[PDB]
Design a protein around this ligand. Structure first.
Ligand SMILES: CCCCCCCCO[C@@H]1O[C@H](CO)[C@@H](O)[C@H](O)[C@H]1O
Lengths: 48, 149
């Protein structure tokens, strides 16, 4: 009924592994860049 | 330029305005002024310089007579070395759309007086030079940025 079966699960594994790695590696690069805005601090200094 | 300092060297001492704070100038005391003079205005850290139609000897002679204050302990001959100032990549934006123009200032950490590289750097800074509305130079100026500007 589904001869691929085997190669299908084999890939699945591979997918889960890249997908784990790559998703994490990007969680970094998303934060890294965003940090600038998250750490940011502002103040309202009217005139005298 | 003050703000530039205030955040480029932020947190350190270099990152302060020369004129000092509003609170300080409101409370400094005869006392505090005294100390500054006393603690800082010391001969091993002062330099008598001059140029003109003067004889070297004649000059020094005067020094010997008024710049007396001869010292005892080694402390007084020592130049207090200063704490390092940490550069920090960052920005500080002060907005007021009510102003006619906007000033921006970008910078990297410099090398420090001693370094023989400052020469190269100044050679560079010359390549880009500077420009300003009145410059008769115009579209023919040599500074790429000046030209585009
Ligand atoms: C369940 C039936 C499995 C038949 C295929 C046996 C080989 C499985 O293996 C896979 O075969 C692919 C072929 O398309 C190759 O591209 C893969 O690299 C290989 O790992």
């Amino acid at each position: 009924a589904e001869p691929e079966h085997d190669q299908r699960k084999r890939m699945g594994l591979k997918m889960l592994l890249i997908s784990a790695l790559l998703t994490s590696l990007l969680y970094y690069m998303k934060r890294h860049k965003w940090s600038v805005l998250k750490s940011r601090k502002m103040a309202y200094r009217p005139p005298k | 330029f003050d703000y530039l300092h205030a955040t480029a060297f932020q947190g350190t001492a270099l990152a302060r305005t020369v004129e000092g704070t509003t609170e300080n100038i409101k409370h400094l005391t005869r006392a505090d002024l005294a100390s500054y003079i006393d603690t800082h205005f010391k001969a091993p850290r002062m330099v008598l310089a001059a140029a003109g139609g003067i004889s070297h000897k004649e000059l020094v002679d005067a020094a010997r007579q008024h710049f007396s204050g001869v010292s005892f302990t080694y402390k007084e001959d020592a130049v207090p070395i200063l704490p390092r100032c940490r550069f920090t990549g960052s920005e500080i934006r002060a907005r007021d759309d009510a102003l006619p123009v906007a000033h921006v200032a970008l910078a990297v950490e410099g090398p420090g007086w001693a370094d023989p590289d400052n020469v190269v750097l100044h050679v560079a800074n010359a390549i880009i030079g500077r420009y300003d509305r009145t410059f008769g130079g115009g579209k023919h100026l040599s500074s790429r940025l000046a030209a585009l500007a």
